[PDB]
């Protein structure tokens, strides 16, 4: 009998669930090629996270591990959870929050996190991770940092990594839809968050975008996700049981309470709308509105078209 | 009619409200030398943020601005809000989320954020900010990045800054309690979040600590804050009116459901406990417990001592 709700925070104060950035737009992308299968920002309406999704904003697209010396002055990393708890294979696709961008270089900045190594001196290590490299095995807990600086880092150093920026592979653009190949063969427990297929009734998937230093992207420096991280954290906190086939939301002007558009959020944890034909759908709406739960509805509830005709 | 609550997320999945890091401890510091007056992580129980506190996890201890050339190849920054909205003086102490560490160097990593500047090439600028230097004027919207790399950045470049690490000043240790001098004279509107005084009844302030690359700290790489960021986000979302002089919380083992300790959270937005005499108070409790609202209480409700005798 805990009733379902969404966070009533304005869109442009909530954050991406695949990079640590503010949300500043929502778009649709119906005629786009890739499957939709992000591993971060995946959460059911009753609060079960899927893939590698963490509830922790400060773990989104981070990773942590201990260093070892790999061939040709490459820096191997044995992964742990960002909390420092051990990471074991065969249970999830990768550690919690682990970045899910497969189509380009991760230019990373790391710091030492052992307090005894933080009494003095420069704790930073930088480098790049190439998820398309053959020595990228996050399911089994290991990856490589190419061209580290310093070249020489003592074995067993505990490092916490951030993605400072992403870039395209040579002669391609960087597609932020493409998830990594996590390697191995995943147990049933460690299964990827499923892919999401286009719903019916003229509906198209809604993406929440952030501007992000993603250099050479197909999207013009924009990272899409299926749910704001605050939605993930809200559903995990609430654990409201699913009581309908989908959940109708209204996107409200917060001051004047006018309804700016109708959306559906499905049990599997993604939002849809029906774009006004020939326009950008929700992209033209102001970004300072607030989502509110109206009611559960069935799958065939017909949404009012949102946006302008063009 | 909206009843008060706190997020029922385990402590060690919630995040600091003064740096973007996981919480991994809670401590007390009764014989602490400094006043308690953080500007980030400040929120009333009914959801009014104070100081520079933002609701947005991805704005905590970040800042943004446009570059200009300052004397001696110093890199001046004209601040904006992290959202890119303009920042104007005389309304807040500094932009939303602006870092509130005054006692040491900020070693910062910035990226370009203009999509047209992100089609190719390396978008990173690094440097350090010295909040104790005379050209640090965050209230009026301007600061300086010393020793930038590149040392030549075009004027008017939009940059988003993160604090990669902090370090002590020469011949001192870095005290993370010390807030910056924001400069100028603050209007009534732009007032600092007030300082917090020790409450009675044998209570002492509870700090939520993160391990963080703060080099040479008085705390050994630990950043304290008064509220998890998720508490800030929760109170802003809920807006539950204050209906008592303080709010009694229990810190519950989430599986065994047993009570590990009693705490009070006050309307002004800080947590207290009564340490068992001679011990570290809440510091010895497991960090995977969950805070639960019991009831409103008066200021003179007597907490059972928490922790061990030593
Ligand atoms: C090794 C190096 O410096 N290479 C330069 C190019 O940059 C590399 O380009 C690759 C794709 O072709 C890939 O994106 C690499 O990640 C990228 O290397 C990164 O960026 C450079 C600038 C350095 O900082 C490296 O340390 C870093 O790993 C560069 O290509 C241009 O920029 C990159 C970011 C990419 O957008 C590419 O498409 C652009 O043409 C070229 C020309 O500037 O110069 C070197 O080859
Ligand atoms: C300019 C420089 O390289 N200085 C070195 C010292 O580092 C500086 O120390 C200052 C305090 O005395 C202050 O913290 C500066 O921020 C710090 O400079 C930073 O760290 C160094 C290592 C470089 O990366 C700089 O680019 C950066 O700005 C260094 O002091 C020792 O480390 C620092 C972090 C601090 O903890 C200090 O107390 C330590 O003694 C010394 C000895 O290694 O070497 C240079 O002087
Ligand atoms: Cl019911
Ligand atoms: Cl709602
Ligand atoms: Cl989690
Ligand atoms: Cl240690
Ligand atoms: Cl049903
Ligand atoms: Cl219906
Ligand atoms: Cl009532
Ligand atoms: Cl209620
Ligand atoms: Cl509660
Ligand atoms: Cl805010
Ligand atoms: Cl009482
Ligand atoms: Mg899992
Ligand atoms: Mg203000």
Author numbering:
A (entry chain B), B (entry chain A): 231 to 540
Provide text from the study:
Histo‐blood group antigens (HBGAs) are thought to play a major role among the host cellular factors influencing norovirus infection. Genogroup I, genotype 9 (GI.9) is the most recently identified genotype within genogroup I, whose representative strain is the Vancouver 730 norovirus. We determined the crystal structures of the protruding domain of the GI.9 capsid protein in the presence or absence of Lewis antigens.
In this study, we demonstrate that the GI.9 norovirus preferentially binds Lewis antigens over blood group A, B, and H antigens, as revealed by an HBGA binding assay using virus‐like particles.
